Symmetry: C2
Subunit: 255 residues, 2 copies
Amino acid sequence: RCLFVCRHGERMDVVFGKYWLSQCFDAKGRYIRTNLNMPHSLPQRSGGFRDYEKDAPITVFGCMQARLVGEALLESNTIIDHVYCSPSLRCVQTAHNILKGLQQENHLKIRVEPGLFEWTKWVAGSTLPAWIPPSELAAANLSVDTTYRPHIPISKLVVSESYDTYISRSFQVTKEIISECKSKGNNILIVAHASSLEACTCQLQGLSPQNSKDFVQMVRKIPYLGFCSCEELGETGIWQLTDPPILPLTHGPTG
Amino acid sequence: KRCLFVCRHGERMDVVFGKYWLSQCFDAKGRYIRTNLNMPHSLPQRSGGFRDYEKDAPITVFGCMQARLVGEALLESNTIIDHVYCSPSLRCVQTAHNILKGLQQENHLKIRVEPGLFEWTKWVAGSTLPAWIPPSELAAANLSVDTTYRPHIPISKLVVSESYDTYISRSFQVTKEIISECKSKGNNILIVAHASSLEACTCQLQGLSPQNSKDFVQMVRKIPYLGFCSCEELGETGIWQLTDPPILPLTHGPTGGFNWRE
């Protein structure tokens, strides 16, 4: 029926900088917040807090951005039946807070899908980031499904992949996600990255894939929690872009 | 100890959505139809209709949240607030109200609306002051305002298109009046007002020399929303000095991407 793709919320490493860990972790590794936009606590990572370097969480206003989207979906009576998300912490946290706003934290389990991760050229680093596994996510108070079997596993991701690769696996996973939810529920929410909003949806329309230049141009346009929607053309296998069921979310900075 | 806290209002509708945010939000009949998640679900009705919003804009949803977090931080630091005053601008009143909610003092503290805390009237467009909402109408619209309170500088005493050092002066007098009336009835005072107010209300209180207008404006434009400065007094002396704020600062960025799509 309907596919909703949206981008994650505000990130710590963007608002507070590349050296943000020095602003919230002391010598002994204790978390000490220095700003009201930093969350009261952060999950423990199986490996230490330097794993946050490559996999930063969302800010307190990131949680709000997500929650308002959640609440907006509830106010418009848009029922989400399954939620998928990228393995990035920021994406999981965004997905979780959308559910809080949806009043469905204790009825839906988020399906962490590595195939939804962004184009690996934009990794700020040499290797893939250490992601927090589903089991360890659930224990950090994020509503994930430890049962879920990913269509693309972590090992299948090529470090520093190419445009054609990324676009291809984006299409496969979306197609796969669309298949395994046909029998169960009407609407599907993907919570992922700016790139995901374009790559995952381009062929869904039946329109030819735009080249990498016109794709970067399209990706820089998407805001935090930027939210798009696709409707199924009867049962034709092509989906067209609909007007989203909620209003857009715009705000400035502190100044 | 005895502290004075001065903080700027939260994010404004007319900055985020522009001078003509009304044309977006209100239809021909005067019905409020929000077009963004950062717009509140409703707005208070005004005496002269929605066109009164032109020069007295409300805060945004994120503006409300900013105020809420600051209130919650104050509660977490165990900072008791005994009195709260605000500029008569709707944005300041609403900011103060949401600070009280985070503080869990909505139904205990009553905000004192004080026209002398209003910003420099040179920044008001036209040759006429904003159609402010009176305290009685404010209470009726769910903002914990003190209807009893009698302002030190009423609306009629405000000079339209006033000069810098006049603004500087009345800011100084009003702060001193506010301090003086609260001396016997408690310790900590919160003032919720404008960017200019942080330097204006506290400069000469600390004996410091006010800056000239040009240097003043430059400083003013750096103060973030809910920017929060603090002053402490040495016992019963009337000598005030700057102190570290008893809460953390608040910083966040914009929504990003494009402002307009499709």
